[PDB]
Amino acid sequence: SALEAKLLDEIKQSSNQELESSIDQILESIINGGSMLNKFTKKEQILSEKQQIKQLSPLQRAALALKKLETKLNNTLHE
Amino acid sequence: NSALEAKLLDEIKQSSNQELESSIDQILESIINGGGSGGGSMLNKFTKKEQILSEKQQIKQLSPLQRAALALKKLETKLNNTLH
C-alpha cells in the first residue's frame, strides 16, 4: 500500500546499471528544478554542483537525491 | 542555501557506505510505516500488518543500491502526487 508491488518489482528486476541510470536521472531532475544577480549566481551554483556530483559514487548520488527530494516534499507540505 | 548544499555534498562524499545505507534504510522504514491502521475491522488491520511484513521481507533481500533507488522512486511518486 505504501510501496506498491509495481514499484518493488521494478526495483527487484533492475541490474545495478539500470539503478545507476535511474538514480542519475532523478538527481539531475532535482538539481535542475529573481534578479539578474540571483539568476546568474544560481546558474553558476548549479554548474558547480553538477561537476561535484560527477565525483560521487552511485550510493552517494542516491543519498544526495533522497535528501533533496525529502526537502522538496517537506517544503511542499510545510513540515 | 548554497553554502549548506556544498557542505552536505562534502559530508556525503566523506561518509562511509554503512553511514549512507543507515540513513537510506531508516528513511525507507519511515515511508513503509507512515500509514494508518488499515480500516475498522480486525481483518482490515490484520491484512495491513501482513502487507507491511511482506514489504519489509522484500526490502531485506534488496541490495543497498536497490533500497536507495526504491526510496527515490517512492518520493518522486509522492512529490508528483503532491505538487499541483
Side-chain angles (χ1 to χ4, degrees):
Chain A
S1 196
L3 292 172
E4 291 279 353
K6 281 157 170 191
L7 188 46
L8 277 152
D9 302 347
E10 176 192 347
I11 296 301
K12 286 189 212 171
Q13 292 155 22
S14 297
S15 65
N16 285 306
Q17 183 168 339
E18 172 163 13
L19 298 166
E20 291 160 6
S21 297
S22 173
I23 289 159
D24 286 348
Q25 290 166 208
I26 293 166
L27 180 56
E28 173 86 355
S29 182
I30 325 143
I31 297 292
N32 286 337
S35 57
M36 193 48 72
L37 173 74
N38 195 79
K39 286 176 171 99
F40 173 60
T41 301
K42 184 152 177 173
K43 283 181 182 213
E44 293 216 294
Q45 281 165 177
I46 288 165
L47 287 167
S48 182
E49 183 161 19
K50 286 185 177 187
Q51 284 318 288
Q52 299 177 58
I53 284 166
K54 287 172 171 182
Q55 303 185 322
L56 299 181
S57 65
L59 193 65
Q60 289 162 359
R61 291 186 187 162
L64 182 61
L66 189 53
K67 192 283 181 173
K68 291 188 81 56
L69 289 174
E70 287 278 33
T71 293
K72 174 65 188 180
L73 180 66
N74 290 339
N75 288 350
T76 304
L77 297 175
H78 300 85
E79 295 167 316
Chain B
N1 75 328
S2 179
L4 294 176
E5 182 82 354
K7 187 183 185 67
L8 174 68
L9 206 142
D10 284 356
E11 290 204 2
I12 288 174
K13 197 183 190 305
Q14 292 161 26
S15 292
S16 71
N17 291 337
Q18 194 276 334
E19 281 166 347
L20 294 180
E21 286 163 19
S22 186
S23 296
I24 292 156
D25 290 354
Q26 287 179 75
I27 275 90
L28 198 51
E29 272 201 315
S30 75
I31 296 168
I32 293 157
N33 287 320
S37 298
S41 75
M42 297 178 75
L43 277 190
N44 286 158
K45 291 190 186 64
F46 159 76
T47 304
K48 189 47 137 59
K49 177 186 169 80
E50 298 301 332
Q51 282 176 323
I52 294 172
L53 286 178
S54 178
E55 299 176 3
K56 284 181 201 297
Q57 173 62 59
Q58 290 175 69
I59 287 161
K60 186 167 71 186
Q61 305 197 246
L62 296 178
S63 67
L65 199 61
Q66 279 175 312
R67 286 190 282 281
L70 174 65
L72 293 183
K73 263 280 198 181
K74 172 63 188 178
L75 293 185
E76 184 185 40
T77 305
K78 183 155 198 172
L79 270 163
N80 173 77
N81 303 342
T82 307
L83 299 167
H84 47 255

Tab-separated table of all heavy atoms in Angstrom, chain A residues 2-61:
chain	number	residue	atom	x	y	z
A	2	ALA	N	1.861	1.309	0.894
A	2	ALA	CA	2.829	2.407	0.952
A	2	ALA	C	3.860	2.254	-0.161
A	2	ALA	O	4.251	3.237	-0.793
A	2	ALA	CB	3.512	2.458	2.312
A	3	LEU	N	4.315	1.019	-0.375
A	3	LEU	CA	5.126	0.673	-1.535
A	3	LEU	C	4.359	-0.301	-2.394
A	3	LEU	O	4.223	-1.476	-2.039
A	3	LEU	CB	6.455	0.034	-1.142
A	3	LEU	CG	7.422	0.973	-0.447
A	3	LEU	CD1	8.596	0.150	0.052
A	3	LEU	CD2	7.866	2.109	-1.366
A	4	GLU	N	3.832	0.198	-3.505
A	4	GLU	CA	3.132	-0.655	-4.457
A	4	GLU	C	4.030	-1.753	-5.007
A	4	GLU	O	5.231	-1.546	-5.201
A	4	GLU	CB	2.565	0.182	-5.600
A	4	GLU	CG	1.418	1.078	-5.173
A	4	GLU	CD	0.081	0.350	-5.104
A	4	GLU	OE1	0.003	-0.840	-5.509
A	4	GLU	OE2	-0.907	0.975	-4.643
A	5	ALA	N	3.428	-2.916	-5.276
A	5	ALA	CA	4.165	-4.053	-5.778
A	5	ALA	C	4.821	-3.723	-7.117
A	5	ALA	O	5.888	-4.245	-7.425
A	5	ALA	CB	3.250	-5.268	-5.910
A	6	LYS	N	4.180	-2.865	-7.908
A	6	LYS	CA	4.726	-2.470	-9.209
A	6	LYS	C	6.083	-1.817	-9.042
A	6	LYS	O	6.995	-2.056	-9.826
A	6	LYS	CB	3.761	-1.515	-9.916
A	6	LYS	CG	2.582	-2.204	-10.572
A	6	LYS	CD	1.438	-1.227	-10.745
A	6	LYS	CE	0.350	-1.818	-11.619
A	6	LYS	NZ	-0.619	-0.757	-11.983
A	7	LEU	N	6.207	-1.016	-7.996
A	7	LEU	CA	7.446	-0.313	-7.683
A	7	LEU	C	8.511	-1.262	-7.139
A	7	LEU	O	9.658	-1.246	-7.594
A	7	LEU	CB	7.161	0.830	-6.715
A	7	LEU	CG	8.298	1.796	-6.426
A	7	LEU	CD1	9.002	2.241	-7.709
A	7	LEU	CD2	7.749	2.984	-5.647
A	8	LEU	N	8.152	-2.100	-6.172
A	8	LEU	CA	9.104	-3.066	-5.661
A	8	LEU	C	9.575	-3.989	-6.766
A	8	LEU	O	10.758	-4.243	-6.867
A	8	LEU	CB	8.484	-3.896	-4.542
A	8	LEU	CG	8.548	-3.199	-3.204
A	8	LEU	CD1	7.381	-3.676	-2.342
A	8	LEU	CD2	9.881	-3.503	-2.545
A	9	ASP	N	8.650	-4.467	-7.597
A	9	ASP	CA	9.013	-5.338	-8.736
A	9	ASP	C	9.987	-4.699	-9.707
A	9	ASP	O	10.934	-5.353	-10.106
A	9	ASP	CB	7.781	-5.842	-9.494
A	9	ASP	CG	6.822	-6.615	-8.606
A	9	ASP	OD1	7.198	-6.978	-7.465
A	9	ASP	OD2	5.666	-6.845	-9.044
A	10	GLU	N	9.781	-3.428	-10.060
A	10	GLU	CA	10.675	-2.736	-10.967
A	10	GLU	C	12.098	-2.737	-10.398
A	10	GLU	O	13.057	-3.002	-11.115
A	10	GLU	CB	10.165	-1.309	-11.207
A	10	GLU	CG	11.066	-0.438	-12.065
A	10	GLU	CD	10.678	1.037	-12.026
A	10	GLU	OE1	9.570	1.374	-11.534
A	10	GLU	OE2	11.495	1.866	-12.487
A	11	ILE	N	12.207	-2.444	-9.104
A	11	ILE	CA	13.493	-2.414	-8.433
A	11	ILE	C	14.096	-3.823	-8.350
A	11	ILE	O	15.306	-3.986	-8.589
A	11	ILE	CB	13.350	-1.791	-7.017
A	11	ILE	CG1	12.916	-0.325	-7.117
A	11	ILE	CG2	14.639	-1.905	-6.227
A	11	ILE	CD1	13.854	0.588	-7.892
A	12	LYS	N	13.292	-4.817	-7.961
A	12	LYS	CA	13.790	-6.197	-7.905
A	12	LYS	C	14.387	-6.649	-9.225
A	12	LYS	O	15.367	-7.388	-9.239
A	12	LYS	CB	12.684	-7.172	-7.500
A	12	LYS	CG	12.319	-7.118	-6.044
A	12	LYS	CD	11.391	-8.286	-5.773
A	12	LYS	CE	10.397	-7.978	-4.699
A	12	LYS	NZ	9.413	-9.080	-4.663
A	13	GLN	N	13.804	-6.178	-10.324
A	13	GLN	CA	14.162	-6.622	-11.671
A	13	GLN	C	15.335	-5.856	-12.301
A	13	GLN	O	15.762	-6.192	-13.396
A	13	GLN	CB	12.921	-6.558	-12.563
A	13	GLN	CG	11.850	-7.575	-12.185
A	13	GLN	CD	10.445	-7.167	-12.606
A	13	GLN	OE1	10.258	-6.350	-13.519
A	13	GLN	NE2	9.439	-7.743	-11.940
A	14	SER	N	15.845	-4.860	-11.576
A	14	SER	CA	16.871	-3.965	-12.074
A	14	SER	C	18.259	-4.440	-11.752
A	14	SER	O	18.566	-4.772	-10.610
A	14	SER	CB	16.702	-2.584	-11.437
A	14	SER	OG	15.467	-1.993	-11.807
A	15	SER	N	19.120	-4.390	-12.756
A	15	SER	CA	20.561	-4.535	-12.563
A	15	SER	C	21.115	-3.272	-11.941
A	15	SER	O	20.436	-2.252	-11.937
A	15	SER	CB	21.232	-4.711	-13.916
A	15	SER	OG	21.074	-3.535	-14.704
A	16	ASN	N	22.369	-3.315	-11.482
A	16	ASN	CA	22.995	-2.118	-10.894
A	16	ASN	C	23.088	-1.038	-11.959
A	16	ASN	O	22.928	0.145	-11.674
A	16	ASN	CB	24.394	-2.440	-10.345
A	16	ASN	CG	24.340	-3.222	-9.051
A	16	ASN	OD1	23.680	-2.800	-8.103
A	16	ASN	ND2	25.057	-4.339	-8.990
A	17	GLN	N	23.352	-1.449	-13.187
A	17	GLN	CA	23.457	-0.487	-14.255
A	17	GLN	C	22.160	0.292	-14.436
A	17	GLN	O	22.169	1.509	-14.603
A	17	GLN	CB	23.853	-1.198	-15.553
A	17	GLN	CG	24.055	-0.220	-16.698
A	17	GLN	CD	24.722	-0.884	-17.901
A	17	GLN	OE1	25.370	-1.919	-17.770
A	17	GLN	NE2	24.553	-0.296	-19.090
A	18	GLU	N	21.045	-0.431	-14.414
A	18	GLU	CA	19.739	0.194	-14.539
A	18	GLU	C	19.439	1.116	-13.344
A	18	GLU	O	18.934	2.213	-13.508
A	18	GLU	CB	18.686	-0.914	-14.679
A	18	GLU	CG	17.265	-0.418	-14.618
A	18	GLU	CD	16.265	-1.431	-15.155
A	18	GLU	OE1	16.619	-2.625	-15.357
A	18	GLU	OE2	15.108	-1.018	-15.397
A	19	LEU	N	19.762	0.665	-12.143
A	19	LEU	CA	19.566	1.512	-10.939
A	19	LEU	C	20.362	2.807	-11.017
A	19	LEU	O	19.870	3.894	-10.662
A	19	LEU	CB	20.025	0.708	-9.728
A	19	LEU	CG	19.214	-0.565	-9.510
A	19	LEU	CD1	19.916	-1.505	-8.527
A	19	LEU	CD2	17.785	-0.249	-9.049
A	20	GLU	N	21.610	2.687	-11.466
A	20	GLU	CA	22.504	3.861	-11.540
A	20	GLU	C	21.939	4.906	-12.508
A	20	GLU	O	21.972	6.119	-12.235
A	20	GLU	CB	23.914	3.422	-11.936
A	20	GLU	CG	24.599	2.621	-10.840
A	20	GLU	CD	25.752	1.778	-11.319
A	20	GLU	OE1	26.123	1.882	-12.509
A	20	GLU	OE2	26.276	0.989	-10.502
A	21	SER	N	21.377	4.437	-13.629
A	21	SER	CA	20.753	5.339	-14.594
A	21	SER	C	19.535	6.027	-14.018
A	21	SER	O	19.418	7.230	-14.151
A	21	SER	CB	20.392	4.613	-15.892
A	21	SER	OG	21.570	4.149	-16.510
A	22	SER	N	18.677	5.274	-13.316
A	22	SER	CA	17.536	5.834	-12.614
A	22	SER	C	17.990	6.893	-11.588
A	22	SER	O	17.461	8.002	-11.593
A	22	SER	CB	16.750	4.727	-11.909
A	22	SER	OG	15.728	5.277	-11.077
A	23	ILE	N	18.984	6.547	-10.777
A	23	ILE	CA	19.496	7.486	-9.723
A	23	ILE	C	20.027	8.771	-10.373
A	23	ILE	O	19.693	9.870	-9.938
A	23	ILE	CB	20.582	6.825	-8.860
A	23	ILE	CG1	19.949	5.768	-7.959
A	23	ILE	CG2	21.304	7.867	-7.971
A	23	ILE	CD1	20.928	4.718	-7.451
A	24	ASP	N	20.829	8.625	-11.425
A	24	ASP	CA	21.449	9.782	-12.087
A	24	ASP	C	20.390	10.705	-12.665
A	24	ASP	O	20.507	11.934	-12.566
A	24	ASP	CB	22.348	9.334	-13.246
A	24	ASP	CG	23.649	8.711	-12.782
A	24	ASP	OD1	23.963	8.824	-11.591
A	24	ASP	OD2	24.367	8.096	-13.628
A	25	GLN	N	19.364	10.121	-13.267
A	25	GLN	CA	18.343	10.937	-13.927
A	25	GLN	C	17.441	11.641	-12.921
A	25	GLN	O	17.060	12.789	-13.138
A	25	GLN	CB	17.529	10.123	-14.933
A	25	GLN	CG	18.335	9.720	-16.160
A	25	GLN	CD	17.658	8.652	-16.991
A	25	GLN	OE1	18.325	7.862	-17.668
A	25	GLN	NE2	16.332	8.626	-16.964
A	26	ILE	N	17.108	10.973	-11.822
A	26	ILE	CA	16.318	11.638	-10.776
A	26	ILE	C	17.114	12.778	-10.127
A	26	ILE	O	16.594	13.872	-9.912
A	26	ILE	CB	15.811	10.633	-9.710
A	26	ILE	CG1	14.797	9.684	-10.372
A	26	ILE	CG2	15.174	11.373	-8.539
A	26	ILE	CD1	14.424	8.435	-9.584
A	27	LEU	N	18.381	12.514	-9.828
A	27	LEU	CA	19.243	13.538	-9.260
A	27	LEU	C	19.356	14.746	-10.194
A	27	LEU	O	19.222	15.886	-9.750
A	27	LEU	CB	20.623	12.976	-8.931
A	27	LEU	CG	21.620	13.970	-8.323
A	27	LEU	CD1	21.113	14.657	-7.057
A	27	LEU	CD2	22.908	13.213	-8.031
A	28	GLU	N	19.585	14.498	-11.480
A	28	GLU	CA	19.686	15.577	-12.459
A	28	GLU	C	18.411	16.413	-12.498
A	28	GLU	O	18.469	17.653	-12.569
A	28	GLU	CB	20.005	15.002	-13.842
A	28	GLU	CG	19.979	16.018	-14.974
A	28	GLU	CD	21.289	16.773	-15.179
A	28	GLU	OE1	22.252	16.609	-14.390
A	28	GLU	OE2	21.358	17.538	-16.164
A	29	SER	N	17.262	15.736	-12.432
A	29	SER	CA	15.988	16.451	-12.388
A	29	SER	C	15.834	17.373	-11.171
A	29	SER	O	15.389	18.532	-11.307
A	29	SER	CB	14.815	15.470	-12.466
A	29	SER	OG	13.589	16.197	-12.463
A	30	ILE	N	16.196	16.893	-9.981
A	30	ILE	CA	16.019	17.737	-8.779
A	30	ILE	C	17.025	18.892	-8.742
A	30	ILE	O	16.686	19.985	-8.270
A	30	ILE	CB	16.125	16.991	-7.431
A	30	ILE	CG1	15.579	15.592	-7.494
A	30	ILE	CG2	15.381	17.751	-6.327
A	30	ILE	CD1	16.410	14.651	-6.661
A	31	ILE	N	18.248	18.657	-9.224
A	31	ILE	CA	19.269	19.719	-9.293
A	31	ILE	C	18.820	20.819	-10.247
A	31	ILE	O	18.993	22.006	-9.953
A	31	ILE	CB	20.675	19.200	-9.681
A	31	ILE	CG1	21.184	18.246	-8.612
A	31	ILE	CG2	21.658	20.359	-9.898
A	31	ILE	CD1	21.486	18.907	-7.284
A	32	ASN	N	18.241	20.424	-11.383
A	32	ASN	CA	17.718	21.405	-12.338
A	32	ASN	C	16.522	22.188	-11.797
A	32	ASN	O	16.406	23.395	-12.027
A	32	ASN	CB	17.366	20.738	-13.668
A	32	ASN	CG	18.590	20.373	-14.485
A	32	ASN	OD1	19.658	20.948	-14.312
A	32	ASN	ND2	18.438	19.408	-15.381
A	33	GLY	N	15.652	21.508	-11.059
A	33	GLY	CA	14.433	22.131	-10.552
A	33	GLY	C	13.452	22.259	-11.700
A	33	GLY	O	13.084	21.257	-12.320
A	34	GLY	N	14.496	35.393	-10.046
A	34	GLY	CA	14.664	36.625	-9.271
A	34	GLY	C	15.321	37.737	-10.071
A	34	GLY	O	14.998	37.950	-11.230
A	35	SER	N	16.258	38.442	-9.444
A	35	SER	CA	17.047	39.465	-10.119
A	35	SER	C	18.054	38.815	-11.068
A	35	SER	O	18.252	37.593	-11.013
A	35	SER	CB	17.785	40.289	-9.064
A	35	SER	OG	18.590	39.442	-8.257
A	36	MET	N	18.697	39.623	-11.906
A	36	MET	CA	19.785	39.160	-12.773
A	36	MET	C	20.946	38.579	-11.961
A	36	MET	O	21.538	37.564	-12.341
A	36	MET	CB	20.294	40.291	-13.673
A	36	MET	CG	21.194	39.819	-14.804
A	36	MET	SD	20.485	38.401	-15.679
A	36	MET	CE	19.166	39.212	-16.558
A	37	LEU	N	21.257	39.228	-10.845
A	37	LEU	CA	22.295	38.745	-9.935
A	37	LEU	C	21.924	37.363	-9.387
A	37	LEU	O	22.756	36.441	-9.369
A	37	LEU	CB	22.527	39.756	-8.801
A	37	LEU	CG	23.460	39.322	-7.673
A	37	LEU	CD1	24.891	39.369	-8.178
A	37	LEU	CD2	23.287	40.238	-6.465
A	38	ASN	N	20.673	37.223	-8.946
A	38	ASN	CA	20.163	35.939	-8.441
A	38	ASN	C	20.253	34.836	-9.505
A	38	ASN	O	20.723	33.731	-9.211
A	38	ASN	CB	18.715	36.100	-7.942
A	38	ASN	CG	18.241	34.927	-7.088
A	38	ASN	OD1	18.566	34.833	-5.903
A	38	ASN	ND2	17.441	34.043	-7.682
A	39	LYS	N	19.820	35.155	-10.729
A	39	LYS	CA	19.790	34.209	-11.860
A	39	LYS	C	21.186	33.727	-12.233
A	39	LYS	O	21.425	32.522	-12.389
A	39	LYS	CB	19.155	34.864	-13.087
A	39	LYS	CG	17.648	35.037	-13.016
A	39	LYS	CD	17.154	35.789	-14.250
A	39	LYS	CE	15.637	35.800	-14.347
A	39	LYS	NZ	15.040	37.072	-13.844
A	40	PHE	N	22.092	34.680	-12.397
A	40	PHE	CA	23.467	34.371	-12.692
A	40	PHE	C	24.089	33.526	-11.575
A	40	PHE	O	24.690	32.493	-11.862
A	40	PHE	CB	24.266	35.654	-12.900
A	40	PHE	CG	25.740	35.429	-13.049
A	40	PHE	CD1	26.237	34.646	-14.092
A	40	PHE	CD2	26.638	35.978	-12.132
A	40	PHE	CE1	27.601	34.433	-14.222
A	40	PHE	CE2	28.002	35.777	-12.273
A	40	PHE	CZ	28.482	34.997	-13.310
A	41	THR	N	23.929	33.944	-10.311
A	41	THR	CA	24.511	33.202	-9.178
A	41	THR	C	23.987	31.749	-9.152
A	41	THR	O	24.762	30.798	-8.976
A	41	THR	CB	24.225	33.909	-7.830
A	41	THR	OG1	24.780	35.237	-7.853
A	41	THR	CG2	24.806	33.144	-6.658
A	42	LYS	N	22.681	31.586	-9.339
A	42	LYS	CA	22.104	30.250	-9.355
A	42	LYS	C	22.651	29.379	-10.475
A	42	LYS	O	22.930	28.213	-10.250
A	42	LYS	CB	20.580	30.304	-9.390
A	42	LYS	CG	19.915	28.936	-9.315
A	42	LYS	CD	18.535	29.039	-8.691
A	42	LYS	CE	17.825	27.697	-8.680
A	42	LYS	NZ	16.556	27.778	-7.907
A	43	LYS	N	22.808	29.936	-11.678
A	43	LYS	CA	23.374	29.170	-12.810
A	43	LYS	C	24.790	28.671	-12.482
A	43	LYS	O	25.133	27.500	-12.708
A	43	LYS	CB	23.337	29.976	-14.127
A	43	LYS	CG	21.953	30.018	-14.757
A	43	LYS	CD	21.934	30.779	-16.065
A	43	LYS	CE	20.522	30.836	-16.634
A	43	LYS	NZ	20.553	30.826	-18.111
A	44	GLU	N	25.594	29.554	-11.908
A	44	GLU	CA	26.942	29.178	-11.508
A	44	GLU	C	26.911	28.062	-10.464
A	44	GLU	O	27.748	27.171	-10.499
A	44	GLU	CB	27.703	30.393	-10.991
A	44	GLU	CG	27.978	31.401	-12.080
A	44	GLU	CD	29.315	32.065	-11.901
A	44	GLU	OE1	29.479	32.800	-10.900
A	44	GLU	OE2	30.201	31.838	-12.762
A	45	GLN	N	25.946	28.112	-9.545
A	45	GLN	CA	25.886	27.134	-8.438
A	45	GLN	C	25.485	25.754	-8.936
A	45	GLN	O	26.018	24.722	-8.483
A	45	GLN	CB	24.916	27.618	-7.359
A	45	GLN	CG	25.563	28.684	-6.481
A	45	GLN	CD	24.588	29.478	-5.633
A	45	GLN	OE1	25.005	30.331	-4.843
A	45	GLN	NE2	23.293	29.203	-5.772
A	46	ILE	N	24.544	25.749	-9.878
A	46	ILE	CA	24.045	24.501	-10.433
A	46	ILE	C	25.159	23.831	-11.233
A	46	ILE	O	25.393	22.626	-11.091
A	46	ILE	CB	22.783	24.718	-11.274
A	46	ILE	CG1	21.593	25.031	-10.358
A	46	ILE	CG2	22.481	23.486	-12.116
A	46	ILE	CD1	20.391	25.622	-11.076
A	47	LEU	N	25.889	24.619	-12.023
A	47	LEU	CA	27.003	24.076	-12.802
A	47	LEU	C	28.094	23.512	-11.893
A	47	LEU	O	28.636	22.455	-12.169
A	47	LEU	CB	27.579	25.130	-13.750
A	47	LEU	CG	26.702	25.466	-14.968
A	47	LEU	CD1	27.201	26.729	-15.660
A	47	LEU	CD2	26.632	24.290	-15.939
A	48	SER	N	28.410	24.225	-10.814
A	48	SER	CA	29.389	23.758	-9.836
A	48	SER	C	28.931	22.454	-9.193
A	48	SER	O	29.720	21.502	-9.048
A	48	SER	CB	29.594	24.800	-8.742
A	48	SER	OG	30.579	24.356	-7.826
A	49	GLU	N	27.665	22.408	-8.804
A	49	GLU	CA	27.179	21.209	-8.136
A	49	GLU	C	27.209	20.014	-9.078
A	49	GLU	O	27.506	18.886	-8.645
A	49	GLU	CB	25.780	21.405	-7.583
A	49	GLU	CG	25.304	20.184	-6.815
A	49	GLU	CD	24.157	20.503	-5.885
A	49	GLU	OE1	23.502	21.548	-6.093
A	49	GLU	OE2	23.926	19.707	-4.958
A	50	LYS	N	26.897	20.237	-10.351
A	50	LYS	CA	26.916	19.146	-11.317
A	50	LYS	C	28.315	18.570	-11.522
A	50	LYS	O	28.490	17.353	-11.675
A	50	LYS	CB	26.291	19.572	-12.640
A	50	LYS	CG	24.782	19.690	-12.574
A	50	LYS	CD	24.221	19.985	-13.956
A	50	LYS	CE	22.709	20.021	-13.901
A	50	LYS	NZ	22.113	20.132	-15.260
A	51	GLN	N	29.315	19.441	-11.485
A	51	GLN	CA	30.704	18.978	-11.524
A	51	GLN	C	31.029	18.121	-10.318
A	51	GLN	O	31.691	17.077	-10.439
A	51	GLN	CB	31.682	20.160	-11.620
A	51	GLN	CG	31.732	20.779	-13.011
A	51	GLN	CD	31.729	19.724	-14.116
A	51	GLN	OE1	32.718	19.016	-14.328
A	51	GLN	NE2	30.604	19.612	-14.821
A	52	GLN	N	30.555	18.536	-9.151
A	52	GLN	CA	30.873	17.785	-7.942
A	52	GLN	C	30.169	16.430	-7.910
A	52	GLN	O	30.764	15.435	-7.496
A	52	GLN	CB	30.531	18.597	-6.702
A	52	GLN	CG	31.317	19.890	-6.628
A	52	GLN	CD	30.912	20.702	-5.440
A	52	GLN	OE1	31.004	20.232	-4.314
A	52	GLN	NE2	30.445	21.924	-5.679
A	53	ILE	N	28.926	16.383	-8.393
A	53	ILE	CA	28.154	15.141	-8.440
A	53	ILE	C	28.877	14.065	-9.277
A	53	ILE	O	28.802	12.885	-8.976
A	53	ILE	CB	26.746	15.440	-8.966
A	53	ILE	CG1	25.936	16.102	-7.846
A	53	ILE	CG2	26.035	14.198	-9.475
A	53	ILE	CD1	24.639	16.756	-8.326
A	54	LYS	N	29.579	14.494	-10.324
A	54	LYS	CA	30.349	13.577	-11.144
A	54	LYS	C	31.364	12.776	-10.330
A	54	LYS	O	31.673	11.637	-10.668
A	54	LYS	CB	31.040	14.344	-12.277
A	54	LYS	CG	30.080	14.794	-13.367
A	54	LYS	CD	30.774	15.711	-14.369
A	54	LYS	CE	29.890	15.998	-15.573
A	54	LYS	NZ	30.587	16.858	-16.575
A	55	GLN	N	31.853	13.352	-9.235
A	55	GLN	CA	32.832	12.667	-8.384
A	55	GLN	C	32.250	11.704	-7.348
A	55	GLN	O	32.988	10.962	-6.692
A	55	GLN	CB	33.736	13.680	-7.682
A	55	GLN	CG	34.476	14.609	-8.625
A	55	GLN	CD	35.449	15.503	-7.881
A	55	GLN	OE1	35.157	15.974	-6.774
A	55	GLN	NE2	36.611	15.737	-8.478
A	56	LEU	N	30.925	11.713	-7.211
A	56	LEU	CA	30.234	10.880	-6.238
A	56	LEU	C	29.952	9.485	-6.789
A	56	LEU	O	29.690	9.331	-7.988
A	56	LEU	CB	28.894	11.527	-5.851
A	56	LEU	CG	28.902	12.916	-5.195
A	56	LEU	CD1	27.451	13.305	-4.882
A	56	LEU	CD2	29.731	12.930	-3.924
A	57	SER	N	29.957	8.491	-5.897
A	57	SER	CA	29.553	7.108	-6.247
A	57	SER	C	28.038	7.020	-6.432
A	57	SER	O	27.339	7.932	-6.037
A	57	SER	CB	29.909	6.158	-5.125
A	57	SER	OG	29.151	6.475	-3.965
A	58	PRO	N	27.536	5.885	-6.959
A	58	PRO	CA	26.091	5.768	-7.138
A	58	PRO	C	25.325	5.884	-5.819
A	58	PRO	O	24.295	6.565	-5.755
A	58	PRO	CB	25.938	4.359	-7.712
A	58	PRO	CG	27.191	4.158	-8.494
A	58	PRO	CD	28.275	4.808	-7.671
A	59	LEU	N	25.861	5.276	-4.756
A	59	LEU	CA	25.172	5.376	-3.459
A	59	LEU	C	25.188	6.800	-2.921
A	59	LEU	O	24.233	7.230	-2.285
A	59	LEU	CB	25.788	4.413	-2.456
A	59	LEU	CG	24.995	4.186	-1.175
A	59	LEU	CD1	23.652	3.509	-1.450
A	59	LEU	CD2	25.824	3.289	-0.249
A	60	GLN	N	26.308	7.493	-3.121
A	60	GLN	CA	26.406	8.889	-2.675
A	60	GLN	C	25.428	9.781	-3.426
A	60	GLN	O	24.752	10.618	-2.807
A	60	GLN	CB	27.830	9.380	-2.822
A	60	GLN	CG	28.773	8.745	-1.814
A	60	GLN	CD	30.244	8.863	-2.193
A	60	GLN	OE1	30.623	9.409	-3.227
A	60	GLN	NE2	31.087	8.356	-1.330
A	61	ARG	N	25.349	9.598	-4.742
A	61	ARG	CA	24.358	10.303	-5.566
A	61	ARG	C	22.927	10.027	-5.048
A	61	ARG	O	22.087	10.937	-4.938
A	61	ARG	CB	24.487	9.889	-7.035
A	61	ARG	CG	25.783	10.407	-7.654
A	61	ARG	CD	25.836	10.116	-9.131
A	61	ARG	NE	27.150	10.463	-9.655
A	61	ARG	CZ	27.626	10.014	-10.807
A	61	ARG	NH1	26.888	9.200	-11.575
A	61	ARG	NH2	28.848	10.388	-11.201
